[PDB]
Amino acid sequence: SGAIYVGNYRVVNRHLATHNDWANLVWEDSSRDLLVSSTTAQGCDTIARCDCQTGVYYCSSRRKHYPVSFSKPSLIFVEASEYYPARYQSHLMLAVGHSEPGDCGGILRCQHGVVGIVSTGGNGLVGFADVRDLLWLDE
Ligand SMILES: COc1ccccc1CN1C[C@@H](C(N)=O)CCC1=O
Ligand SMILES: [Zn+2]
C-alpha cells in the first residue's frame, strides 16, 4: 500500500483505489496502473521533474529503503495477476530488487523528489509507475 499526496491530489496504484478514490476521480489510466483522486486536505510531497535513473525506494516486505538504478519509463510486458490480464504496461521503470504484491505504493525518490510508486515485481526485479510526466499534479 501507499500513496503520493501533492496539492489537492492523491496518487495511488489503480488496482488499489478505494470507493472514495473512484467517487472523487480526477484521472485514471489502466495501462499505467495509476489513479488520481481529489483531497480536501493539502498535501506537501514534492514531484521530481528530471530524467534521473538512480534513486531510493521503500520496500514494505523488508521494512527497508534500497538504493537502485532504474530504466527510463517505457512499455514493458507484465504477466497476468488477479487485477489485470497479461499486457504491456506503459510508463514503467525497472530495477534489480525485491518486490512483492503488497509492496505496491512504496515511493521511489531521487534528489529532486518523488519519481514514482512500486507497481510490478517478481524474478528479482521491481517496477515503478512513473509520475514525473504528470505536470498538472503541481497546479
Ligand atoms: C509477483 O507479482 C508482483 C510482485 C510485485 C508487485 C506486483 C506484482 C504483480 N501485480 C502486478 C500489478 C500490475 N501493475 O500489473 C497488479 C497487481 C499485482 O499483484
Ligand atoms: Zn531526479
UniProtKB/Swiss-Prot annotation:
Quaternary assembly: Homodimer.
Record's function text: Cysteine protease that cleaves viral polyprotein and specific host proteins. It is responsible for the autocatalytic cleavage between the P1 and P2 regions, which is the first cleavage occurring in the polyprotein. Also cleaves the host translation initiation factor EIF4G1, in order to shut down the capped cellular mRNA translation. Inhibits the host nucleus-cytoplasm protein and RNA trafficking by cleaving host members of the nuclear pores. Counteracts stress granule formation probably by antagonizing its assembly or promoting its dissassembly.
Active site: residue positions: H15, D33, C104
Covered range of the whole protein: 869 to 1007 of 2193
Ligand binding (Zn(2+) 1): C50, C52, C110, H112
Reaction equation(s) it catalyzes: Selective cleavage of Tyr-|-Gly bond in the picornavirus polyprotein
Record's protein name: Protease 2A
